[PDB]
Structure 1
Amino acid sequence: GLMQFTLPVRLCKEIELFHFDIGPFENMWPGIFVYMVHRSCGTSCFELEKLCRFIMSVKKNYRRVPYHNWKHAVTVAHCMYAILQNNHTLFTDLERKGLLIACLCHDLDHRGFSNSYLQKFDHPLAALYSTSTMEQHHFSQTVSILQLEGHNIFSTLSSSEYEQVLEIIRKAIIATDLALYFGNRKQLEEMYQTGSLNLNNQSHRDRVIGLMMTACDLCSVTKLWPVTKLTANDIYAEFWAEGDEMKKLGIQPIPMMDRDKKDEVPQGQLGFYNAVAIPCYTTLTQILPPTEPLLKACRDNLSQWEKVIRGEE
């Protein structure tokens, strides 16, 4: 209880910034995560013995895939930690608790395949959940781990706060289905421009938390160029394995997943930055002004992809 966590000076300082990279030492990710809950939520939010066991069971149920892995989870939790510490007073005690957990759990047990591949392969998870297949699976795995003995980190919540927090985490995890993002931003855009957006409207909060989740999940585009460039290799390594599998089923994959068409990657990042990231972080900054650094950083990296095409790198 009087047992704090402290990081080295450079991390203690760098961790508060949006473009923080968590580093290549796995064994520090759990303490980074705990350090973030303690400063974000309080030293009193979670019983340390239980939280630690929950963190380690979460790590265990992430797989060894190039991109949708344990490192991805802690990255996306840290980005949410940045958003919550730059918007201190806009968020309830419960929201802070569940959003950091939602982010850590958001891709539990990912196999490195798209919802599409599960339906074209006819995977059992496509039989059980017809939309946001993996994301419904991810939430389900979160509840599993929350019901392992000694793992209920929410034990001290009322019956009703417990249901409130499991609902914040369910919508939050569903929201990371990027297919759902496009409508969610369109609505938020129109609600802010017409002046209807109201943060005491629970269905408005839900959309807003929805957009933070897409923001945190996409945060490789908001990092320093060498981190962005090296993460994109991991992103394409999964997509190309999926394309490989698509070809095995007897289906031409989309070019994004065709390793024959690597040459077009720079042009594909452009499309993606314009269609997805820039809109994401534009709409997010209008709603949440102190997240501007995410937009500025995303814009810099768009500019760095434009450079790659012009053969300037």
Structure 2
Amino acid sequence: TRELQSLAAAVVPSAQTLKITDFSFSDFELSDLETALCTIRMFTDLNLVQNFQMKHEVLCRWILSVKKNYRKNVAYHNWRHAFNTAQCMFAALKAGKIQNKLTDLEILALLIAALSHDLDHRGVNNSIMEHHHFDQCLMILNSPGNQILSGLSIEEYKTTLKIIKQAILATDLALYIKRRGEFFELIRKNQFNLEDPHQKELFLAMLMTACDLSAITKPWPIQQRIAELVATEFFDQGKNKIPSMQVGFIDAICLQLYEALTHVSEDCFPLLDGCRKNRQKWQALAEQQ
């Protein structure tokens, strides 16, 4: 109750003071407590505390719960990565102007999903995984003192819970590759329409992958640092091939996604832009072997 006390007691600086609206945001210099505050600020400015009557001590306790159920011993797949995915969701919603295209319940679900989508990850070297992540998510959402959805009606609740699940499931890269075909194909023909339930759900899945991979879009000194973390998990847990690997990952997985995303909303362009700049940096490196 120590950590809970001083998080509950704390005052929560604005979104601007916290820089959680910048696509180029980083957390390297933030204490855990500070990340907890940033996360509170996120729920608040998306109007989630308002519209769904969340009690402060419950939201605080829920966040500390999510944080605790990530493992420090894992280099990349930990609370910070979860934290950053949620921040990128937030920036895409505000700066990227995606808030306008989605319902409140969807937004609530995307935020929770981003924060929870890798819960209890033990490292890439230890959609099966995603089902286990959603499980952790549910268990926490139903824990006494932690019920941040209690204010929702049973209908709202069921709808939110189903969306949370699809969102976490969507972070299986396998699922992303299988489904992106239809997404790119739709946009290609200027047919993509969010008001169709089926495409709406597809977009939420793609948005999830986009935030999940947002590290690839960060300013070069930041991306280099993060790439180092994922290298630590990949190879040590538990010529240099990495720059070539990164260029491959960017080509196969990242570029088209961020291209499609900016097509949906011109203001997500920075994600695309940061990704390209990073490809440039990794390719130069690759050519020196």
TM-score, length basis structure 2: 0.89
1:5 aligns with 2:12: yes
1:109 aligns with 2:120: yes
| Cα pair 1:185 1:283 within 8 Å, conserved | no
Report deviation, 1:43: 4.0
1:48 aligns with 2:56: yes
Report deviation, 1:4: 6.8
Aligned positions of 1:1-313 closer than 5 A: 5-7=12-14, 11-12=17-18, 14-24=19-29, 25-44=31-50, 45=52, 46-64=54-72, 65-85=74-94, 86-113=97-124, 132-241=127-236, 263-311=240-288
Q: Output the CA distance in 2 between the equivalents of 1:230 and 1:299.
A: 17
Report deviation, 1:31: 0.3
| Cα pair 1:94 1:165 within 8 Å, conserved | yes
Report deviation, 1:166: 0.5
Report deviation, 1:78: 0.2
Report deviation, 1:194: 2.4
Q: Which runs of 5+ in 1 are unaligned?
A: 118-131, 246-261
Q: Output the CA distance in 2 between the equivalents of 1:4 and 1:91.
A: 29
**Which residue type is aligned with residue 23 of structure 1?**
F
**Which residue type is aligned with residue 276 of structure 1?**
I
3-state SS in 2 of match to 1:154: coil
Q: Deviations over 1:193-219 (max 9, x none)?
A: 223322111111111010111100101
TM-score, length basis structure 1: 0.83
Q: Deviations over 1:231-270 (max 9, x none)?
A: 111111111146xx7xxxxxxxxxxxxxxxx711111111
| Cα pair 2:82 2:114 within 8 Å, conserved | yes
Aligned residues: 274
Q: Output the CA distance in 1 between the equivalents of 2:252 and 2:282.
A: 14
Matched residue, 1:256: none
3-state SS in 2 of match to 1:274: helix
Q: Which runs of 5+ in 2 are unaligned?
A: 1-9
Give the CA RMSD over aligned residues.
1.9
Q: Deviations over 1:80-103 (max 9, x none)?
A: 001111223111111111111110
| Cα pair 2:70 2:119 within 8 Å, conserved | yes
Q: Output the CA distance in 2 between the equivalents of 1:67 and 1:176.
A: 15
Q: Output the CA distance in 1 between the equivalents of 2:265 and 2:203.
A: 9
Report deviation, 1:36: 1.1
Q: Output the CA distance in 1 between the equivalents of 2:162 and 2:175.
A: 17
**Which residue type is aligned with residue 220 of structure 1?**
A
Q: Output the CA distance in 1 between the equivalents of 2:48 and 2:70.
A: 27
Q: Output the CA distance in 1 between the equivalents of 2:47 and 2:207.
A: 17
